[PDB]
């Protein structure tokens, strides 16, 4: 039970650092540009909804 739990923890930090690697890829894309448009309309929708 102890090692099984340890292995789950080991999995959680391993897949976490892999997520960091995907994040560095995401911030490169001109999705970086295209999602600003998404944010722009979202803020328009939000602030008018108040």
């Amino acid at each position: 039970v102890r090692y099984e739990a340890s292995l789950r923890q080991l999995e959680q930090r391993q897949l976490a650092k892999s997520v960091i690697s995907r994040v560095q890829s995401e911030l490169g894309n001109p999705k970086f540009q295209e999602k600003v448009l998404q944010q722009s309309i979202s803020e328009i929708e939000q602030l008018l909804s108040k």
């Binding site: 039970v1 090692y3 099984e4 292995l7 789950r8």
Partner: protein, 58 residues
């Protein structure tokens, strides 16, 4: 067993424990020595008892 997520050894040790569930076999050895001891003891006890009872009345 439901805690473990690596379970293919809980069935192993569950069945191994329940297999070897007799972990030691019985001993009754006090039936040969206790009767022998009881005979000498009883003899000596009765000898003392009768002897002193006789002496009391004497």
């Amino acid at each position: 067993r439901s805690v473990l997520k690596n379970t293919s050894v809980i069935d192993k040790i569950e069945s191994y424990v329940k297999q070897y569930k007799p972990v030691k076999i019985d001993a009754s050895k006090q039936l040969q020595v206790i009767e022998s001891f009881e005979k000498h003891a009883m003899t000596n006890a009765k000898e003392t008892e009768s002897l002193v009872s006789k002496e009391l009345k004497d």
